[PDB]
Amino acid sequence: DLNTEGDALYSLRQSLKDANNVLQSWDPTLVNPCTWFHVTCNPDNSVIRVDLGNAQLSGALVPQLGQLKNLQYLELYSNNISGTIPNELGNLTNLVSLNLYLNNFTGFIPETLGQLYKLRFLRLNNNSLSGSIPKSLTNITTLQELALDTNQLKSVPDGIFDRLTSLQKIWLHTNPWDCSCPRIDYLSRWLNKNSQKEQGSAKCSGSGKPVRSIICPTS
Ligand SMILES: *[C@@H]1O[C@H](CO)[C@@H](O)[C@H](O)[C@H]1NC(C)=O
Numbered sequence: 001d002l003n004t005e006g007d008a009l010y011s012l013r014q015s016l017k018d019a020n021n022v023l024q025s026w027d028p029t030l031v032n033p034c035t036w037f038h039v040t041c042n043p044d045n046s047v048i049r050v051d052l053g054n055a056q057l058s059g060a061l062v063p064q065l066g067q068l069k070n071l072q073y074l075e076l077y078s079n080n081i082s083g084t085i086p087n088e089l090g091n092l093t094n095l096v097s098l099n100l101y102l103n104n105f106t107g108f109i110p111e112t113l114g115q116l117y118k119l120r121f122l123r124l125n126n127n128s129l130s131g132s133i134p135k136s137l138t139n140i141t142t143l144q145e146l147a148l149d150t151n152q153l154k155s156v157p158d159g160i161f162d163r164l165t166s167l168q169k170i171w172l173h174t175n176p177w178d179c180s181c182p183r184i185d186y187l188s189r190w191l192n193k194n195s196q197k198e199q200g201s202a203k204c205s206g207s208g209k210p211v212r213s214i215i216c217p218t219s
Pocket of ligand 1: 066067086087088089090091112
């Protein structure tokens with residue numbers, strides 16, 4: 001009997017590159033992947049977290065990774081994972097923490113990420129993600145820590161942070177933010193009103209000014 005979770009997890013092994021045989025224990029012919037290293041399962045023998053931080057992994061992620069229904073912690077930080085973030089990651093309903101920082105992800109941030117209504121920690125920092133931040137992120141009301149620094153983000157949809165009443169920390173620095181008025185109006189005012197939330201200082205592209213300092217005139 002094929003475990004389906006291990007099958008989905010084996011699809012990830014088939015595309016990644018070790019180079020260290022970190023995934024040597026990932027044998028899908030077993031009854032379940034709960035005895036796999038870097039993999040924890042619940043008492044119902046279902047994968048609830050994947051810890052592959054600092055494993056020197058190359059390659060791209062797979063759409064099969066969204067098959068893990070009971071996944072809570074996806075730790076893929078500190079690797080050389082390239083390509084775009086799969087939209088199927090928005091299927092991870094029970095995902096609490098998505099750690100994808102320190103990789104080489106490109107493209108846009110998936111709008112399907114807003115379907116993660118249990119997500120409390122989202123770290124996509126230190127990548128090459130281009131703007132802008134998905135509008136559906138406003139639906140993640142449980143979001144507490146949002147790390148998006150060190151990317152290529154340019155803008156923000158107006159009023160996106162307003163429904164985020166559980167937001168504690170937010171990283172936005174090191175990004176080519178478009179500080180042209182009236183586009184930067186909302187982000188400038190929000191970061192000023194929630195300066196205790198912003199970790200580091202988001203700079204404006206070109207001028208290098210903190211966007212919190214920008215005051216857009218009307219007419
Ligand atoms: C996974 O998400 C994609 C959207 O990116 C969707 O088309 C697909 O049906 C989802 N799969 C499951 C099993 O929910």
